[PDB]
């Protein structure tokens, strides 16, 4: 029973670089952030990742474990943000507009430590949402951890958090 539970929007990036080497897109931390959500009975996580993330580990973007984006992409889980090369440069879309956009409409929750506030100052109506609904997190190794006070002591509790209730 999870439509009691608000739908998850998580920032595959942030999450991959913030878990193992902070040089490192770590994508096992994607796995570690979607199973937490997972175990509490969310049936609607989506993840945002970048298209190009798909190629092969260069020295300049060093990736780890890729197998699992299309893994998450087979089981309905992540999507990837449009990308290409046109005349020998990549250019990317931008996923954070994705997944603020995402996360708004679908009134849900973000999962990132990025504050969007580039996005926010744009739009006010994106600033409230996610100065409400947004979930920082640390990891411990192979430890999610997102904090019991979201929005500080006067917030609610982080099981509050995730229910529409
Ligand atoms: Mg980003
Ligand atoms: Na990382």
Not at 55 to 70: K, N
Not at 90 to 112: M, T
């Amino acid at each position: 029973d999870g439509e009691n539970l608000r739908p998850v929007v998580i920032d595959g990036s942030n999450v991959a670089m913030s878990h193992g080497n902070k040089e490192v897109f770590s994508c096992r931390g994607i796995k570690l952030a979607v199973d937490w959500f997972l175990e509490r009975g969310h049936k609607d996580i989506t993840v945002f990742v970048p298209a190009w993330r798909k190629e092969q580990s260069r020295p300049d973007a060093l990736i780890t474990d890729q197998e699992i984006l299309r893994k998450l992409e087979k089981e309905k889980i992540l999507v990837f943000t449009p990308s290409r090369r046109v005349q020998g440069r990549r250019v990317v879309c931008y996923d954070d507009r994705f997944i603020v956009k995402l996360a708004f409409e679908s009134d849900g929750i973000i999962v990132s430590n990025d504050n969007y506030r580039d996005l926010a100052n744009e739009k006010p109506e994106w600033k409230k949402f996610i100065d409400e609904r947004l979930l920082m997190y640390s990891f411990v190794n192979d430890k999610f951890m997102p904090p019991d006070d979201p929005l500080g002591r006067h917030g609610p509790s982080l099981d509050n958090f995730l229910r529409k209730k």
